[PDB]
Amino acid sequence: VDYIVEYDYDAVHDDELTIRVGEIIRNVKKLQEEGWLEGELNGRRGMFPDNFVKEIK
Ligand code: NA
């Protein structure tokens, strides 16, 4: 499942992904923590909040 980034988000720690409007995050998985997803961008995996992105269907 891929997601499209709809709002910029900036990582505040290493395990988070910095993401930018229009980029596709690939292979997104849900986390135990509510409000957070994990996925791959540009060869790197990290988490980010789910309100910045939209599931591509
Ligand atoms: Na690259």
Swiss-Prot record:
Crosslink position(s): Glycyl lysine isopeptide (Lys-Gly) (interchain with G-Cter in SUMO2): K57
Disease: Focal segmental glomerulosclerosis 3: A renal pathology defined by the presence of segmental sclerosis in glomeruli and resulting in proteinuria, reduced glomerular filtration rate and progressive decline in renal function. Renal insufficiency often progresses to end-stage renal disease, a highly morbid state requiring either dialysis therapy or kidney transplantation.
Domain SH3: 1-57
Domain notes: The Pro-rich domain may mediate binding to SH3 domains.
PTM comment text: Phosphorylated on tyrosine residues; probably by c-Abl, Fyn and c-Src.
This protein's name: CD2-associated protein
Compartments where found: Cytoplasm, Cytoskeleton; Cell projection, Ruffle; Cell junction
Physiological role: Seems to act as an adapter protein between membrane proteins and the actin cytoskeleton. In collaboration with CBLC, modulates the rate of RET turnover and may act as regulatory checkpoint that limits the potency of GDNF on neuronal survival. Controls CBLC function, converting it from an inhibitor to a promoter of RET degradation. May play a role in receptor clustering and cytoskeletal polarity in the junction between T-cell and antigen-presenting cell. May anchor the podocyte slit diaphragm to the actin cytoskeleton in renal glomerolus. Also required for cytokinesis.
Expression across tissues: Widely expressed in fetal and adult tissues.
Subunit structure: Homodimer. Interacts with F-actin, PKD2, NPHS1 and NPHS2. Interacts with WTIP. Interacts with DDN; interaction is direct. Interacts (via SH3 2 domain) with CBL (via phosphorylated C-terminus). Interacts with BCAR1/p130Cas (via SH3 domain). Interacts with MVB12A and ARHGAP17. Interacts with ANLN, CD2 and CBLB. Interacts with PDCD6IP and TSG101. Interacts with RIN3. Interacts directly with RET (inactive) and CBLC; upon RET activation by GDNF suggested to dissociate from RET as CBLC:CD2AP complex. Interacts with CGNL1 and SH3BP1; probably part of a complex at cell junctions. (Microbial infection) Interacts (via SH3 domains) with Chikungunya virus non-structural protein 3 (via C-terminus); this interaction plays a role in initiation of viral replication.
Cleavable signal peptide: none
